[PDB]
Amino acid sequence: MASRILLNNGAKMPILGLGTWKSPPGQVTEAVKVAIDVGYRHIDCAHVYQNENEVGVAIQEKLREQVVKREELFIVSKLWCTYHEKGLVKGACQKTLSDLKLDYLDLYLIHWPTGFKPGKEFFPLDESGNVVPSDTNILDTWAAMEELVDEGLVKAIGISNFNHLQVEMILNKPGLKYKPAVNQIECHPYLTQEKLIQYCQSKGIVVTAYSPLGSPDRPWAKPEDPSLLEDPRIKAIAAKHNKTTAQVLIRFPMQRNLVVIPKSVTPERIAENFKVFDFELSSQDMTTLLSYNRNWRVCALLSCTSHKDYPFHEEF
């Protein structure tokens, strides 16, 4: 099991990253520092998570302590939907570089394929609770992302929550300069993404699995929702290998040649989640876990189901 995966730009991406969604500002700085001390070399971020400054502080501290060099870190961020307009993309990236205190990003993703009306609101809603979309399309935005690569501001560009038709639009774009290196998508035993994974890997596109633990801290969780961490079937697989349920959940996407970005702001869990290179799930274990699929999404973007570019109407 290699700890990194070769990307289609030539760079190697560490297959284990720290997620930072819902990491509060007054705790994410310590989280990132503990991550780096423990051995994480991949931090996944986004403007919309409202904590990039605080991630920036932590990276800078560890660079100045000389625990890591910058070229050893792989730092990812995402362009939020309100900045899909072509002329706003660079501004958005620069705002993120400035908060992270970096001169370059290793990877910059289009966060969602849906463009929202520009402004102060992250989710500019209408009367009905539906997002006001921007008069934008995916191809023009991709063109703006490509300029970021040409300027050296980002080493790789990518997409997140794109379906295979949307990825295909980019790949078939007239005058394409850069293929996306990565598709970042929800993926866990309840949403196993077999068809999207097969498509992406066949196109040389690396897949990053998000919400690998089932995002137990998600703000909209309901008591009826299934719970990966509490599944006694997954607990027995963990008990079998003398590991924890979270460790099994993290390791699972790794053996599928995926990148995985579990989130924690608890030092002890940050360390636990890292200890996933010392065991192996069996073939039987993998087939078992794959059979738990139930097309269940944490992030279904339900305010945008009328948006022309809503990703999740299509099968995959």
Ligand X SMILES: NC(=O)c1ccc[n+]([C@@H]2O[C@H](COP(=O)([O-])OP(=O)(O)OC[C@H]3O[C@@H](n4cnc5c(N)ncnc54)[C@H](OP(=O)(O)O)[C@@H]3O)[C@@H](O)[C@H]2O)c1
What are the binding residues for substrate?
111
214, 252, 259, 289: residue in contact with ligand X (rule CB under 6 A) = 214
Q: Does 48 bind ligand X (CB under 6 A)?
A: no
Q: Does 215 bind ligand X (CB under 6 A)?
A: yes
Q: Are 109 and 205 in contact (CB under 8 A)?
A: no
Q: Are 196 and 160 in contact (CB under 8 A)?
A: no
**Amino acid in position 161:** N
Shortest Cβ 269–ligand X spacing (Å): 4
Catalytic pick among 49, 83, 199, 310: 49
Q: Are 272 and 247 in contact (CB under 8 A)?
A: yes
Catalogue the E-assigned strands of 102-166: 107-110, 157-160
Residues within window 5-44 making contact with ligand X, judged by CB under 6 A = 19-22, 44
Residue 225: partners with Cβ closer than 8 Å, 6 or more residues away: 296
Q: Are 38 and 183 in contact (CB under 8 A)?
A: no
Residues within window 248-277 making contact with ligand X, judged by CB under 6 A = 261-266, 269, 272-273
The CA angle 103-211-253, to the nearest 5 degrees, is 90
Q: Does 166 bind ligand X (CB under 6 A)?
A: no
Active site residue 178: no
161, 163, 183, 192: residue in contact with ligand X (rule CB under 6 A) = 161
Shortest Cβ 28–ligand X spacing (Å): 10
Q: Between 25 and 216, name the residue whose CB sits nearer to ligand X.
A: 216
- DSSP letters along 259-276, please? EE--B---HHHHHHHH--
299, 304, 307, 310: residue in contact with ligand X (rule CB under 6 A) = 299
Q: Between 155 and 243, name the residue whose CB sits nearer to ligand X.
A: 243
Shortest Cβ 303–ligand X spacing (Å): 14
Q: Are 212 and 249 in contact (CB under 8 A)?
A: yes
Burial of 65 (0-12, 13-18, 19+ CB in 10 A): exposed
Q: Between 19 and 133, name the residue whose CB sits nearer to ligand X.
A: 19
Residues in touch with ligand X (CB under 6 A) = 19-22, 44, 111, 160-161, 184, 210-217, 229, 246, 261-266, 269, 272-273, 298-299
Return the active site residues: 49
